[model samples]
Target: AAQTNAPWGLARISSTSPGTSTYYYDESAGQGSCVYVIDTGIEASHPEFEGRAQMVKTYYYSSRDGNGHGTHCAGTVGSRTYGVAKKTQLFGVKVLDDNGSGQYSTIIAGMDFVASDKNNRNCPKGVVASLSLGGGYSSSVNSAAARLQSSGVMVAVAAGNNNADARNYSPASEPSVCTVGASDRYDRRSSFSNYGSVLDIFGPGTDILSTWIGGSTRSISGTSMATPHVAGLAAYLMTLGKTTAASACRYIADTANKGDLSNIPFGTVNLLAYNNYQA
Candidate 1:
């Protein structure tokens, strides 16, 4: 007999144990929510997006994703075939250049755009920002992230992949943002994942598969990949009436699968992201 299988990252989240072959989720997860992907860019026309993803803002002349990072993260957030929130709207805010590098000013500009968009009634139900990029501490970037959160946009940021403390990184270290760390399917913290008290949650990141540029798919690893999972979860929670950033974060932490991961670093929370789905 053959068994149906789901992506390891998706399977791992819906169940407590590993090696699960199915993913369980609410059909209406993330319905009426919007997630702003602040990164390189996105291939919004990719079939996986099913017309739900769009490029709303960009520092570059073109919103096309020359680098594959943003599209992959957006796919994880709400692609038709491999997404956490299947119905959440995806908007790409291209802050990084084609080389996946960007200055703090451009990044802050992207955040500012999201804040304005949310306040202008452009987004529905709830708003969330999925930031899969990070760097050393920058008070300017930190403040921008905080301002976005205060504007009613829940921010989910990647704890850097430095294998050091996440507190040393910007945005991730910002107390107001929900900082996410990386974990493998085996329920262990990824070796390269930044840790410590700055981390708000963990999500499957290693060898995770998602939509790529050129209408393809790829599997990669980084705290970058993990951040969108939490972002999608936050969007899903919004459909369940956790509409505010504080309420969504509180519900996520409170309902996360506790102590299931091994080798969690000191001062890091042991909560693993969960979607509250039942099999």
Candidate 2:
């Protein structure tokens, strides 16, 4: 996924430097949002990831550095200034071991980890979950997420990178979830992004830069990257006192960076504006 991180419109975006913070982070957008990166573990030692990631749960299923997909997803969601949610705290839920692929149970476990009752421990509840991984909505999985959502927790998932039809992807495809699609540097749906009714929104997924395996930086692409751009923004919105999915979605849908949309899904998406609401 790092090989294909989200890149805001090169034509519209003003910079292209690597490892440079601000590839996405806008402090103004998220002054008090708590976000969880439900993916591969973050490189806690990296200057970028250091002190930024909190390990909430670690379940093994990949048994190896699988695909580095989840890690990339985490980078997009909380990488040093990669997206609008930079200031938000990112909790980790390693469902897929090291490898990019994993079993269903592990994900369920991760959800449980996040859904844990934290209010008693003086902890937070109803966390904003950024689930960038999915194969197609699964009743079992949805049931688990629903268990959490019913309690007021929110889940944001990537529609899927297949470009086949988002309707097939899990979590994102699920009617209860907010599915996200990828957009090119120009706000056009990445040719590979899956678009359909399942696509609830769009985020920057073209050649974007953020944090890599440590202090290093690189460009990655995929709806995976785009997924968190929206996730980060969602967390930011909550910081502004928005606590419901509809509230964040509505505000973002109406305020994303304005541009052209003549393609399929990209044409329908409005990249969220990270500047409108800040603490």
Candidate 3:
């Protein structure tokens, strides 16, 4: 049983208790699965990981947490307390530079790298590439994620912090990746969260606390934070037999909470889940 104060991300996904007598009998907590945080980078020595984190691959530079953004996202996706899949092997795929910016082509390269290395690295259950990076629309990045998703890798991307429609972003508009929006603890959509048809689901992001670069903890806010929660959920879902990316998205939709949102999307109001056991 993983415990933490900011476990709202886990609770919201009905993954509060791994291996416990909860609604879902899953206890793997993403043991054999892997989550690739394709962002700035991840600090290789985070205490929350307890030696489970690794810099398996990189595209921009060394797989070290220089900007601290990737470490925070990694924490939310796999840390013992703030993470959804506490035991999932955390891999850093450095697509973005230390400044948290990168070319779209390099980002796509990172995605392809993980997809190509999935099987040869003993990850039979596949991998989830958590992309907390986004800018304007990029067809290359969109298609790259789509292609990988079709094969086996699950992709979860940020809906962008812009308040406008998520359709204006790259991976969010990709249609294949799971585009996650930010919802505060109050269950209200964050003021900076983008919405619309491209959005898949929401997660706690405002004032969210998670691991930082210097083996410390910090609270940050953005759709970036929300994206990893969905990635973590995807990892846990894999442990419960939802191996494919499509199945993870479908389970997320079928099990998500609806009708209890303030600025909910017009048609797809897939709010975070609580105790949904939908099949």
Please report the candidate that would top TM-score against the real structure.
1
Worst 10 residues of 3 by lDDT: 16-25
| Least accurate 10 contiguous residues by lDDT in model 2 | 10-19
Model 1, 1-279: lDDT tens per residue?
111476888877788788787878877778888999999999999998989898988899899999899999999999977788888889899999989999999999999999998765455678999999989999999999999998888899999999999888998999988999999988999999999997889999999899999999999999999998899989988876755676677678888999999998668899999876754
Worst 10-residue lDDT window for candidate 1 reads 1-10
Q: Sort by TM-score, best first.
A: 1, 3, 2
TM-score of each: 0.96, 0.79, 0.90
lDDT (Cα) of model 2:
0.61
Off by over 4 Å in 2: 1-29, 61-67, 117-126, 242-246, 257-259, 265-279
Deviation (Å) of 129 in candidate 1: 0.3
lDDT value for model 1: 0.88
Greater-TM-score candidate between 1 and 3: 1
Best by lDDT: 1
lDDT of 2 by residue, 31-112 (tens): 4456667777665555765486666566764222244555566666655545455556666667766656668887877777
Clashes of each: 0, 27, 0
Superposed on all Cα atoms, model 3 deviates from the true structure by an RMSD in Å of: 3.6
